[PDB]
Design a protein around this ligand. Structure first.
Ligand SMILES: Cc1ccc2c(c1)C(=O)CC1(CCN(C(=O)c3cccc4cn[nH]c34)CC1)O2
Ligand SMILES: Cc1ccc2c(c1)C(=O)CC1(CCN(C(=O)c3cccc4cn[nH]c34)CC1)O2
Lengths: 693, 693
């Protein structure tokens, strides 16, 4: 017992497994729930400093398999786990779910055979994943492991005999390995005959049983661990599409552990805790040479956060847990429940302060969440303090996160107008290599940023089930050699696919200093998913196929200007100057630019409305809210009557509005619906009068 | 008329549009069907040199929109198209479908406003895409274009007036652009008032109508072309998941044209015909500098074939058409029809000749399709001449294509054991840059090869609807710094996702000199998709978590060998040599290797069977054939009874076999089913006795 004379019991002595975990620089698995209690309690504090919280706000029940392999809740001593995988069901009252929401936490035990995945761990992880999926609820995975479990048949180590070519000269080889009759008998003795596959051949003297295959009595040595690995890889692929999935990397995550991190998509990596496939010793031992000094060179945050495998980093375990709790605060309590409304003091009903100018450089984040000034806070488009940026280490020409809009949680995607200096480090395996600077111009989709954009749309849709706003402001894709070689069209096309799959409302909005040209517009037009998408342009946006320089280059050429210098008298009167080129070219540029305006977009039927930035918060608040309400009714009509298109479903529902409701007044439509949900419900129950063959 | 005194009419004079296309180095659009007739006729020739083919074997009917926008078939003069997009419905008798199969060919007209996509082209392309999708039939797109259509309001060019700061000194700017009352009247005169948005302000002298926005009378100038672009981008995303899609790039494909190429996935690029986003003049004009000399530097085959955007190249248009026809020969006639059986002279019932050895280097393609020797043809695993490699320009450590197995068409994926020297060219925009050689070790998944593997699985599943065989032989993923930075875990995880989605039979087979280790096995284990996947190991395969060097490094350490030198007398008798290390280490290596055997895999329940290569063709022929037959019955049972798992569906169907059928004899089960399809049909019709609420 050490230290002595402490005020309360030494928890690291009561259960030495807790000391072991600490010695490995991670939280002991059975203490994680307390981190979730601490994190959940900080959420309430940050939401409402004066709320009275008791311990009944938060409950963690460990899940174990009963005798039939069915998951049950138990309360027991930390460290009684007979497998190296453990899980808890948490029921917590949160600001978004003040009567409670649930989720599972599954976690390796790094103290149990080094957190290795053997068959039983893989089976339990899989049962836990299905438990959550069946229930609709989020699955949090706390990754701390050494990959698949390995081993030899240790019983065979002291028994085997090597059949030498030349007995007293071992030097020039052996023929095979074998068992004597006392080997065979020692095995039969312990009921381990199964451990080995033998071919009998008596060579001169005696019977030698030849080892043809070593099997082993002990489960968890090889391919059976690989089978379980793939089971939980597929289980996690599937869960991503089904529930909110997230992982926290808190000691090494290795092999299957690294795959699990990526497969669950959403990942938070504690600094200094690597995500690796193979360790540096093994890699080095295979290159002869000592290329690598640290597993952090292969999968630290400087690899994975810079990659987009790690969506965030965290300074320690609690911080990562708080980032999880925070990320969940935007997400339905379970699959297909409504997105959690959270109204804060920043209420919908205000103008938007921070307005960008073409003159001046800006951080797009100011437009999103607003900006601190010396004259005080300039409010952005979304609720103050509500912006939770993710994938912030990678592809920095796009900005992604969650935010709230008068309380409505949504995915947000914006464009970074500033040039990214993407510094790529040298490969220590290549002595030739130097660190490389890639400069990434703003408003320009590169392969990284296109990949990030599609990834974001997918991660908003799947599990999060969030509506979305894209603050679209791209000049196009980089069509140069390097970017085209590096497969920009592939990543770009993923954006289309992502939109086609989207199941919640989407708003595309070209902001006040913004543009959408050419390739850019293709990938984001609402006809890609008319059921869910709408587009809007700020009165101070531009759009069309080419920029003005581009358009004049093709349709206001050197000879068309000249004809236009019959707006001049000096030139007019010279038939039977030409250093007004400077300004006649500016005139052509301006003539092109006059096509590229929101008024043209409206005229042409390509946007639902032109907008005013300062008024955009109010507009979108009621638009989005009206959309959520109508989607809810489309869904009810769909759980019921059966076969009709979206267009017939929305027209039936809208035929139910009072004749004086203006179908195009968002606030009115939302208001009427919310006053009459239960009356509508009555109507829907009547429509379940369905002899439909 | 030129030339004169030709034997038959000059087709390029009869329709000068044909001369124009030729002048642009492409086939005139209305002559493509004849290429499909020529290609289809060569298929029959290569299949059966002595078949009598008449012209009624092949029919091309042009599809136009009638007055209601509904697609109808017409026969008319080439060159009467009023839009720059054209389409044909082809009904051809082929060796796989000797009574005929159908598909649509949609194509830009490069002679019609440079093959530009305006709204009407985009609308027609979309209607054609849905026509095919509704019918289930393949959509071939022949891409020859200049991207979205552009334009200014040309009526406004001669009318506009510039409001100078200083009239007789143009030099220091203008304030705006405007229309006089005679401008306004000239517009009203032609019914083009709409063309422009004006604000009236009388400045000293007269009324100036200020141009606030130019709209234009002429459709097809800007954003309305971008709307149609996104419509057909989404339409093509959707079609990929629905029907066989393929594209041939035959003049430039630009902007939306390039996206369409990628979105349809399967692409064949005629040499010298670029796939670009923005042209080199525009790119250069924007860099000031002249970086690029050729659109081929940005999207020629040396970019796109090397990328995997272009699955194949073709030497000219006909060759590309033949590659299409050939690719289709593996594919159902329409969605959800059975895969097309084509038995050739290489019949199932033979051993496999080409066998790889660990001693000698081999091309895995020899194992697939076989090999020409001086002693004559050594047959591979699949039908002689049946192997159609795709994505052969990219990620060459995997080998992908279609093949046939006793006539059964399937996707095949194999591993290239030879090192790839992936030479990456220099970026002409970066004066610093040199060409780089990447060496890619064999049996090692890199990000490119993992991406290719997942892409292939997806492209076999979607539209092709093919079963698949993977000849799995990977040591693992590259876990070093460069490959981990370049996001290997992302591409690897796509393989898992691809398998989860697969809807036809999958066979995973570790071949005779092969291995599957660690990360590699995770991504391909059949528990990822148990409904469709099965695994097998050759008796001469290896598998487990680590290679033997790896395992001894952890579990046969320096002190465990020493104990094992109580197999020696010289060392034994020394208590109260050590340059038998060389050979005691080899012994440990061998002891590890003895765990890694197919016999262990069987013992452990991880493979369905251990196999013998030479016998593998026969085994898999009946296995696959029995699987197709059972899938067909699972599907019928599913179109009917309603709600049951795959496991209950297969057990019901198998309960219908005669009691003497051995459920595990593939040939017997297949034979019984094929003898009794119509009797089974009778049974299924009886089970439609469903009061199920
Ligand atoms: C590094 C980077 C930055 C911006 C970019 C790109 C690359 C691209 O490759 C596409 C694009 C699209 C808009 N563009 C145009 O519309 C245009 C077209 C033709 C000529 C001119 C001249 N200036 N801008 C032009 C210029 C090129 O935007
Ligand atoms: C360039 C390249 C080539 C092959 C590779 C890789 C990289 C990887 O990064 C993974 C792996 C997996 C199999 N490996 C192993 O199983 C193993 C593990 C531990 C030590 C040793 C020593 N040799 N082989 C070892 C060695 C490493 O295969």
């Amino acid at each position: 017992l050490r230290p002595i004379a402490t005020p309360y019991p030494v928890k690291e002595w009561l259960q030495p497994k807790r000391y072991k975990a600490h010695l490995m620089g991670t939280t002991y698995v059975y203490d994680f729930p307390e981190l979730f209690r601490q994190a959940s309690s900080s959420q309430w504090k940050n939401f409402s400093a004066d709320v009275k919280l008791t311990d009944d706000f938060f409950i963690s029940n460990e899940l174990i398999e009963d005798e039939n392999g069915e998951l049950t809740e138990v309360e027991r001593e930390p460290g009684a786990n007979a497998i190296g995988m453990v899980a808890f069901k948490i029921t917590v009252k949160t600001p978004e779910y003040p009567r409670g929401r649930q989720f599972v936490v599954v976690a390796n035990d790094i103290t149990f055979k080094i957190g290795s995945f053997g068959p039983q761990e893989d089976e339990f992880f899989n049962k836990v994943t299905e438990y959550a999926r069946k229930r609709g609820i989020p699955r949090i995975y706390l990754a701390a492991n050494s990959g698949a479990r390995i081993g030899m048949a240790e019983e065979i180590v002291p028994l085997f005999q090597v059949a030498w070519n030349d007995a007293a000269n071992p030097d020039k080889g052996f023929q095979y390995l074998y068992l004597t009759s006392e080997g065979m008998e020692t095995l039969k003795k312990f009921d381990k005959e199964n451990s080995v596959l033998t071919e009998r051949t008596v060579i001169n003297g005696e019977e030698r049983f030849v080892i043809k295959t070593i099997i082993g009595s002990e489960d968890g040595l090889g391919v059976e661990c690989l089978r379980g690995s793939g089971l939980i890889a597929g289980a996690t692929s599937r869960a991503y599409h089904d529930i909110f999935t997230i992982t926290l990397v808190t000691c090494r995550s290795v092999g299957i552990g690294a795959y699990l991190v990526r497969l669950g998509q959403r990942a938070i990596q504690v600094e200094g805790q690597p995500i690796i496939l193979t360790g540096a010793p093994a890699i080095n031992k295979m290159l002869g040479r000592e290329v690598y000094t640290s597993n952090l060179q292969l999968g630290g945050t400087q690899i994975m956060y810079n990659n987009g495998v790690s969506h965030l980093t965290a300074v320690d375990d609690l911080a990562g847990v708080e980032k999880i709790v925070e990320w969940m605060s935007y997400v339905p309590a379970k699959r297909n429940m409504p997105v959690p409304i959270l109204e804060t003091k920043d209420t919908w009903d205000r103008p938007v302060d921070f307005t960008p100018t073409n003159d001046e450089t800006y951080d797009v984040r100011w437009m999103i969440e607003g900006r601190e000034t010396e004259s005080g806070f300039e409010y952005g488009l979304f609720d103050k303090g509500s912006f939770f940026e993710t994938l912030s280490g990678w592809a920095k020409g796009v900005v992604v996160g969650r935010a709230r809009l008068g309380g409505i949680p949504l995915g947000v995607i914006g464009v970074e107008t500033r040039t990214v200096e993407n510094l790529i480090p040298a490969d220590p395996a290549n002595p030739n290599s130097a660190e490389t600077l890639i400069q990434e111009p703003g408003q320009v989709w590169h392969p990284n940023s296109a990949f990030k954009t599609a990834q974001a749309i997918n991660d908003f849709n799947n599990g999060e089930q969030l509506p979305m706003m894209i603050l679209a402001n791209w000049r196009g894709f980089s069509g140069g050699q390097r970017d085209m070689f590096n497969e920009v069209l592939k990543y770009g096309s993923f954006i289309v696919d992502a939109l086609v799959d989207y199941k919640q409302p989407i708003i595309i909005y070209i902001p006040p200093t913004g543009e959408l040209r050419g390739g850019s517009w293709v990938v984001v037009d609402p006809t890609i998913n008319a059921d869910q998408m709408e587009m809007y342009a700020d009165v101070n946006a531009r759009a069309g196929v080419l920029e003005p320089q581009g358009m004049v280059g093709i349709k206001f050429r050197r000879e068309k200007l000249l004809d236009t210098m019959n707006r001049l008298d000096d030139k007019y009167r010279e038939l039977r100057e030409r250093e007004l080129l400077p300004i006649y070219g500016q005139i052509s540029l301006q003539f092109a630019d006059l096509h590229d305006r929101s008024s043209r977009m409206v005229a042409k039927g390509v946007i639902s409305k032109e907008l005013e930035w300062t008024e955009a918060r109010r507009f979108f608040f009621w638009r989005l809210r009206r959309r959520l309400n109508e989607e809810y009714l489309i869904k009810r009509l769909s759980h019921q009557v059966g076969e009709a298109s979206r267009l017939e479903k929305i027209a039936r529902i809208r035929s139910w509005y009072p004749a004086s409701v203006d179908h195009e007044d968002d606030r009115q439509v939302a208001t009427w619906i919310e006053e009459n949900y239960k009356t509508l419900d009555d109507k829907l129950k009547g429509l379940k009068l369905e002899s439909f063959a």
